[PDB]
């Protein structure tokens, strides 16, 4: 354990905190676009429930999709795409 960055949710040691926080303050953090799914798209890799037409989804810049609720929960612990953790 360490100290959690509120911008990206990563925990860092106290002696890494200054340079980490400055970096996260230097550029916009990872974001997604809200959307309503237009057609079924298989299972969400977070919850394993189907991504069904009408679902309230998030589309990340890497083009991955998740339920909005699911990616929001993951972003509380690590603000990164589950499939593209290093972009």
């Amino acid at each position: 354990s360490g100290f959690k960055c509120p911008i990206c949710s990563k925990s860092v040691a106290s002696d890494e905190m200054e340079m980490h926080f400055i970096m996260c303050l230097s550029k916009p953090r990872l974001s997604y676009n809200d959307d309503v799914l237009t057609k079924d798209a298989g299972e969400c890799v977070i919850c394993l429930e189907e991504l069904l037409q009408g679902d309230t989804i998030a589309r990340l810049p890497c083009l991955c999709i998740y339920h909005k609720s699911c990616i929001d929960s993951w972003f509380e612990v690590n603000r990164s795409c589950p499939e593209h953790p290093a972009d």
Binding site: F3, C5, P6, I7, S14, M17, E18, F21, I22, C24, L25, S26, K27, P28, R29
Partner: protein, 150 residues
């Protein structure tokens, strides 16, 4: 007298200031620091200069610094008295943290507000029910209170 840790932190703040943060000891009581935090870029606080007062209690570093905003700010974790709801200032304090990392933590909180904190306030409600308008209000307050205030 000031313990050596405070002397060291003070000298290192002077020699190596944190980018975007001004922090200088008060001339009369060296446990007080006058702080200016730049609003984070790409937040509704961008372009603002926010004054804060920081105080090192007698027990420091066994107790957290006491920090409050002196500039009006529209943020779900800052109340109308300028008090800051931030875990590292209370239950999650650790003596591994220092003035410089406390102030960076506050700046990072400006970039990533937490409207879900258990303490219920009107600003956090606005952030959850109408985030777009809350952000615009934060922008308006930044331009009214946090520009040309230094």
């Amino acid at each position: 007298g000031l313990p050596r840790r405070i002397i060291k932190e003070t000298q290192r703040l002077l020699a190596e200031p944190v980018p975007g943060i001004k922090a200088e000891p008060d001339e009369s009581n060296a446990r007080y620091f006058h702080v200016v935090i730049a609003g984070p870029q790409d937040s509704p606080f961008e372009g603002g200069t926010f004054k804060l007062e920081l105080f090192l209690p007698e027990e420091y570093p066994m107790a957290a610094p006491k920090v409050r905003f002196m500039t009006k700010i529209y943020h779900p974790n800052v109340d109308k008295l300028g008090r800051i709801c931030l875990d590292i200032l209370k239950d999650k304090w650790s003596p591994a943290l220092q003035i410089r990392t406390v102030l960076l933590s506050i700046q990072a909180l400006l970039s990533a507000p937490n409207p879900d904190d258990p303490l219920a306030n009107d600003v956090a409600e606005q952030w959850k029910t109408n985030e777009a308008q809350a952000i615009e209000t934060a922008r308006a307050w930044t331009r009214l209170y946090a520009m040309n205030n230094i």
